[PDB]
Design a binder for this molecule. Structure first.
Ligand SMILES: O=C(Nc1ccc2c(c1)CNC2)c1cc2ncccc2s1
Lengths: 156, 39
């Protein structure tokens, strides 16, 4: 099916009508999304089938057709853009300055933007347009809003 | 059964809507990939 680079919606027809469960990135012939979006299941692109290739529930990442290709990293200083693809709505860039998730294994960037759960897998970009991570895995704060980590994989 | 649909090009947009704060939070990540706040 379609293997052109870009951002894609992950849809299902199992529930009522057509429902958007997430988003993903196509780069170098590899589809990249969050593990909780697909649960490692196969995907369809027109008449073609995309089989999982690599995945990890702890990182909450999965790649299809080949190994993880995205290796750009947040520089710890600059603003970034979330390329939000909300259910039933057009792709939209939103610029923000990331906060920090401080963990026992190191710091990670975090974006404080709230979108439907079906927006999980939407890429976060640097000023060169490079994908520095995916949106959709984080935490709920005092008022009930979400703060997502900038989740990035490792390019072997 | 899941399927994918193209939604756009991956590019930076000059003069996009600029919003959102930058919180510094203490978090923990468990074996199931779930984050939680440590207080
Ligand atoms: O529940 C979510 N994410 C998630 C689900 C299941 C699992 C993980 C993360 C990682 N381990 C398995 C949400 C993503 C999200 N985005 C914007 C606003 C609200 C939400 S809630």
């Amino acid at each position: 099916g379609e293997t052109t680079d870009g951002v894609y919606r992950v849809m299902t027809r199992r529930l009522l009508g057509s429902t958007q469960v997430g988003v993903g990135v196509m780069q170098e012939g590899v589809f990249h999304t969050m593990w909780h979006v697909t649960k490692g299941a196969a995907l369809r692109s027109g008449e073609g089938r995309l089989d999982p290739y690599w995945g990890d529930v702890k990182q909450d990442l999965v790649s299809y057709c080949g190994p993880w290709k995205l290796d750009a990293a947040w520089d710890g200083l600059s603003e970034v853009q979330l390329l939000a693809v909300p259910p039933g709505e057009r792709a939209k860039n939103i610029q923000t300055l990331p906060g920090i998730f401080k963990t026992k294994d190191g710091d990670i960037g975090a974006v404080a933007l709230d979108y439907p759960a079906g927006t999980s897998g939407s890429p976060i970009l640097d000023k060169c347009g490079r994908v520095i991570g995916l949106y959709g895995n984080g935490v709920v704060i005092k008022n009930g809003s979400y703060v997502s980590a900038i989740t990035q994989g490792k390019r072997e | 059964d899941m399927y994918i649909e193209r939604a756009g090009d991956i590019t930076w947009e000059k003069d996009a809507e600029v919003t959102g704060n930058s919180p510094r939070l203490d978090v923990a990540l468990d074996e199931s990939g779930d984050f939680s706040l440590v207080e």
